[model samples]
Target: SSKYKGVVPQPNGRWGAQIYEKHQRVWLGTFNEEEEAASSYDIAVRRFRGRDAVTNFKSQVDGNDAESAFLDAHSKAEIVDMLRKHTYADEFEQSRRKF
Candidate 1:
């Protein structure tokens, strides 16, 4: 019924997102709303892969970085914090940067 990229249905009615790149799986975390899960996957892929990488949300043409704005969300912080600080520092630096 409800389907979104990287979004999987979880027990207890939670929306979950986990992605695979080069056979490596990365959990984008769970959310109460499907859109939140969708947005998380959008940010995760944009943060880890290329800007042109397929995402749940369309890329912003404006100067503002919508990915960074969503990244500021507290729940997203739980997962993206690890993504930002440790692995994929280069992608995070570029994707979430202000310009």
Candidate 2:
């Protein structure tokens, strides 16, 4: 789907979410016919906005299953909002310290 076309890097140095473009822009807001894409976007929004803004908005959309996984049928703004507010670096360090 054109709505999710991008790629993000994982904390472990691996490639993360790969979003695609829908209607010319990276579809990150929401949708009503592509629930899978929306869910994926939610996770991506959380993972990306956590510590990497550049990659967050530039990551490519995953294309393993377009009809079953790349379709967005809901709004993911909440997840994105949560991600924007949370800082993962501090949390990661704190968790490591506990160990």
Candidate 3:
């Protein structure tokens, strides 16, 4: 299994480090720091834990190299709408989950 790592900071001033196992497409819990994340990832790897598959994708708009393929083709409004919908849903879910 391949491992992917990332960090995200919470609104409450805590940091979350995450690990993704490519073979299972599963996202383990976010930890307080890199060390914690690594530890959790090691456990998951050693224990052969796996989860349901997920379909995931990402869009880049502000970086040096933007996405080669555009979602709405040429409508900025459509892109904004998509982003708004996704952002709202993600934030709402996170808030509801107490994460």
Candidate 4:
């Protein structure tokens, strides 16, 4: 039960995150980099948990745009790659971005 609060490593060497919102499990997609995953988790938790949530990690999306170092793993090309034969762009974008 020593799971890290924000992001967790997946079996595929990617990072996984999820937010418990509404009545279902709102899952964030796997990320190539850990910081992106962590930032996304922070943003989502804050949206659901408000300001009192125990966010151990600083939000990269809060102070950064599409490419401001912390989002080193986020890119248009990657987004394109993520969308091919898939239909998960909105969730992924919202998860990986700030409000």
Question: Which of the predicted structures, 1 or 3, would earn the higher lDDT when compared with the native?
Answer: 1
In order, the Cα lDDT scores of the candidates are 0.65, 0.37, 0.36, 0.54
For model 4, where is the 10-residue window of minimal lDDT? 79-88
Candidate 1 root-mean-square deviation in Å? 7.4
> For candidate 1, lDDT tens digit of each residue in 1-91?
4677888898899888777878988776767888877866776776566555688777553257544554544353455655434343354
Give stretches of model 4 more than 4 Å off. 1-3, 21-24, 60-99
> What lDDT tens digits, residue by residue, belong to model 4 across residues 3-93?
5465778777887766565566666666777766665666555545655666657643445443233233445334333433233346445
Which one wins on TM-score?
A: 1
Off by over 4 Å in 3: 1-22, 49-99
- Relative to the true structure, candidate 2 reaches a TM of 0.22
Q: List runs of model 2 lying over 4 Å from the truth.
A: 1-82
Give the alpha carbon lDDT tens digit for every residue of 1-99 in model 3: 213333345445543433344553444454445444443333333223223322122322315322222321324334333332334224323434533
Q: Which should have the higher TM-score, number 3 or number 4?
A: 4
How far off is residue 10 in model 3, in Å? Answer: 7.6
**Superior candidate under lDDT, 1 versus 4:** 1
The best-first sequence of candidates by TM-score reads 1, 4, 3, 2
TM-score of each prediction:
0.61, 0.22, 0.30, 0.49
Q: Write the per-residue lDDT of candidate 2 for residues 1-99, one digit (tens) a residue.
A: 334434343344333233433433343333323433344454654443444323323334334432213223224453343323443224333433533
